């Protein structure tokens, strides 16, 4: 009734049939957290929304080297409602873990309940600017994915990758240029930000624009090298 | 009043059907994907086929650049036409839903303006250049 196809990034599948969808496995069946549908072929599967997750349009916008691998450990900054976090727990599975943080309270409560539902998650609900009150908890992660709309993305990502990220670690950042500047070319804002990170010791591999899914948004990926 | 309730009900049905169609169905991405390569000579010597280590068709394809190592339709009946006809027709069904919704929106605009001409107030009938009329109420507090 439906064909599956594996994807270059492992843990990412595409259902090809009468209608094409981007899909992952699941760990705790008999559920659906955010009203998203599913498909069960036999094994359960769960689709994303690139209109609702940034990382999805990261993938299906065509993204060469994402470093979230199934076994690994992934920090997540700016997890409002944790829908993308649920997708992260699906794509890591039980041998990898996810470290999802949120500042405010209502996405925090929803985060907490979904973390109750799932094993792979530990939620940090403390503020994101200060990394100490959870260096107590987080343990020596592999990769970092962050979307914060606060304009100190360079500073927050610098501090969190300094404190936690493995050497030769993976870092993937989102950007909304319309939050940063809202005067000039979104390309110009993006080039300004890759210069920030390149000063801040992250070697930038790839830049990508999510043009038919969001407006003016960028995803930047890179390696992290030789720090403490 | 009963008329505009009817129209708005139909529009809300169609709006939700549009949302669910877009949720079900996938659109192709189109974004600038720019590589950061340090040395000018290897920048000049770039090829996508080695970099994404694939074949030129699968290179221009951008939802699955499954590698050669990854690489190392008979299911759907007549996939050349039936599958593609179905793909396009799902797209057209979402589009047709959309036009239904915009038209019902406009009908409700006209009906709502009339209902409020009926209500009260001291109106004024102003006439635009283009032929379109409009009303503008006197500056008064409703009591």
């Amino acid at each position: 009734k439906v064909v599956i196809e594996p994807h270059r990034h492992a843990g990412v599948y595409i259902a090809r049939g009468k209608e094409d969808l981007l899909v992952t496995k699941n760990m705790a069946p008999g559920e659906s957290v955010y009203g998203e549908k599913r498909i069960s072929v036999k094994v359960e599967y769960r689709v994303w929304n690139p209109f609702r997750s940034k990382l999805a349009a990261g993938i299906m916008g065509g993204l060469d080297e994402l470093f979230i691998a199934p076994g690994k450990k992934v920090l997540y900054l700016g997890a409002a409602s944790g829908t993308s976090v649920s997708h992260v727990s699906d794509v890591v599975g039980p041998e990898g873990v996810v470290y999802a943080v949120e500042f405010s309270h209502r996405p925090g409560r929803e985060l907490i309940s979904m973390a109750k539902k799932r094993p792979n998650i530990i939620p940090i609900i403390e503020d994101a600017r200060h990394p100490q009150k959870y260096r107590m908890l987080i343990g020596m992660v592999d990769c970092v994915f962050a979307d914060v709309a606060q304009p100190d993305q360079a500073r927050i990502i610098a501090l969190n990758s300094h404190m936690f990220l493995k050497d030769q670690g993976g870092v993937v950042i989102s950007i909304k240029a319309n939050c940063i500047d809202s005067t000039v070319d979104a390309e110009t804002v993006f080039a300004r930000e890759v210069q920030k990170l390149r000063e801040e010791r992250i070697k930038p591999l790839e830049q990508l624009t999510l043009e038919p899914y969001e407006r003016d948004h960028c995803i930047v990926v890179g390696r992290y090298m030789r720090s403490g | 009043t009963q008329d505009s309730n009817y129209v708005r009900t139909l529009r809300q049905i169609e709006l939700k059907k549009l949302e669910k169609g877009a949720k079900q169905l996938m659109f192709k991405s189109s974004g600038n994907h720019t590589i950061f390569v340090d040395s000018r000579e290897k920048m000049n010597e770039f090829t996508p086929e080695k970099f994404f280590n694939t074949t030129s068709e699968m290179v221009n394809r951008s939802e699955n650049r499954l590698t050669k190592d990854q690489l190392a339709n008979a299911s759907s009946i007549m996939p050349k036409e039936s599958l593609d006809k179905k793909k396009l027709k799902k797209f057209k069904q979402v589009k047709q839903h959309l036009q239904r919704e915009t038209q019902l929106k406009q009908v409700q605009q006209r009906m709502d303006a009339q209902r409020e001409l009926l209500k009260k107030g001291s109106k004024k009938k102003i006439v635009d250049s283009s032929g379109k009329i409009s009303f503008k109420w006197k500056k008064q507090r409703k009591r």
Binding site: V3, E5, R16 | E57, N64, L71, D84
Partner: peptide
Amino acid sequence: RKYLNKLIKRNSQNLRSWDLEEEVRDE
């Protein structure tokens, strides 16, 4: 080496038909 390139072309067409169009990729 031809065994590689033959298998290369093999699954290529097995996926080329699964996810493409020509007359439909316009509309």
